[PDB]
Design a protein around this ligand. Sequence first.
Ligand SMILES: CCCCCCCCCCCCCC(=O)SCCNC(=O)CCNC(=O)[C@H](O)C(C)(C)COP(=O)(O)OP(=O)(O)OC[C@H]1O[C@@H](n2cnc3c(N)ncnc32)[C@H](O)[C@@H]1OP(=O)(O)O
Ligand SMILES: O=C(c1cccc(NCc2cc(-c3ccc(Cl)cc3)c[nH]c2=O)c1)N1CCOCC1
Ligand SMILES: [Cl-]
Ligand SMILES: [Mg+2]
Length: 385
Amino acid sequence: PDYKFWYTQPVPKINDEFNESVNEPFISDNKVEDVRKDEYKLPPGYSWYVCDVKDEKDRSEIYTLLTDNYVEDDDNIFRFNYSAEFLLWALTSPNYLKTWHIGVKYDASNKLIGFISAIPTDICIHKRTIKMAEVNFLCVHKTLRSKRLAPVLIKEITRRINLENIWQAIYTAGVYLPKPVSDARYYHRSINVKKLIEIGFSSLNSRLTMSRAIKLYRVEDTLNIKNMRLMKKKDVEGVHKLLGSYLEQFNLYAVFTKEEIAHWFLPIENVIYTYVNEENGKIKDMISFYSLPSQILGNDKYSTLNAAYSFYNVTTTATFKQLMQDAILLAKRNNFDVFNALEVMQNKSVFEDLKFGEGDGSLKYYLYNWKCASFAPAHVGIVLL
Ligand SMILES: CCCCCCCCCCCCCC(=O)SCCNC(=O)CCNC(=O)[C@H](O)C(C)(C)COP(=O)(O)OP(=O)(O)OC[C@H]1O[C@@H](n2cnc3c(N)ncnc32)[C@H](O)[C@@H]1OP(=O)(O)O
Ligand SMILES: O=C(c1cccc(NCc2cc(-c3ccc(Cl)cc3)c[nH]c2=O)c1)N1CCOCC1
Ligand SMILES: [Cl-]
Ligand SMILES: [Mg+2]
């Protein structure tokens, strides 16, 4: 790989190695005045479109583009199917900019063929807190792949983020790019065993028959933490303290305001699930997971796999194993087929005992315009959508 685009950007070369004495931008002393005020040029017949994610019809156009053209596994079995309600939540966090929700239309058809997004957040990297853009949902229509549209989308969102006096970004991808700050494998905990086998995801053998697999993954319908309940507005201050206190140990985390805690955790059916344990007026434990279905490609029976993804989990009255056992149970109670988690924070410590299987690859964490030491994924304290 030559990285002809990426090697023009303020990111590390593949064989760049920085030690912990280095924690700073590649390019400092940036001036909003000097940022390009012209939109990047698109190929003839294509136009920039500012998407209004709060408009049901604009949001439906993003939904359709991602449904048909977003992330697949390397074997083209699954395609991520973020819901329209999920995209509304993901993109309208506190102080979001509409103008960071960037579409490209094909003029002749008036159809959306490209998208990229960012939201603003404070990110703490090796104890330094920096205002950053969190970039996600980069997507080019399958009919227009390998035409160098992605670098146009990346340069245009970089320009718009820079106009807000923001000079760093955080992003994740399954593909290897220059250069990860950390790299986390994903693991899966089967809940609906029979469905996962029927779609070709989970395997059986002469030792693990269907009946034995169903018994292996069977869940007792009783919580270790009896009073775990859906989070309410009254719990925002307590979750801010419990989660905020927990995250300070990590080398990379979001520094959440109380308004960001309310946005990212208060529950929304089929989008975000947060449960809390309240003891003596204090929030002492929390579980959270988001809903991200996958379309099961070419399957006539099942249109989607209903997957819960581990978000943020903290325990002070139970073991981390007991807490994540309760997270699996709460996902089962909410009709999820599988519980997915990355080897970030304390997660890898429970994967063997709670019968998670290792997945087919890894999610890489990246910073834009930041040089620093890389670290093991247990020191990652942030989960992007
Ligand atoms: C200060 C503010 C800064 C803000 C910006 C921060 C950076 C944000 C960066 C974006 C974070 C996004 C986070 C997410 O959303 S990760 C999810 C990405 N989306 C998908 O995987 C959906 C399915 N695939 C697609 O839609 C396309 O394949 C995409 C759009 C991904 C590439 O389109 P296409 O396949 O038609 O290729 P091209 O000819 O246009 O372009 C080829 C160039 O693009 C580089 N490439 C390929 N994949 C990715 C990728 N996932 N991140 C970054 N760069 C990527 C590639 O190495 C090459 O450059 P180089 O190798 O020649 O050098
Ligand atoms: O095998 C997959 C799957 C589905 C789609 C894509 C991929 N691989 C690539 C990939 C991965 C992920 C990913 C997968 C799991 C987790 Cl916990 C966190 C991130 C993100 N971005 C990617 O590009 C893997 N599963 C397991 C069953 O539930 C849906 C996800
Ligand atoms: Cl350029
Ligand atoms: Mg292209």
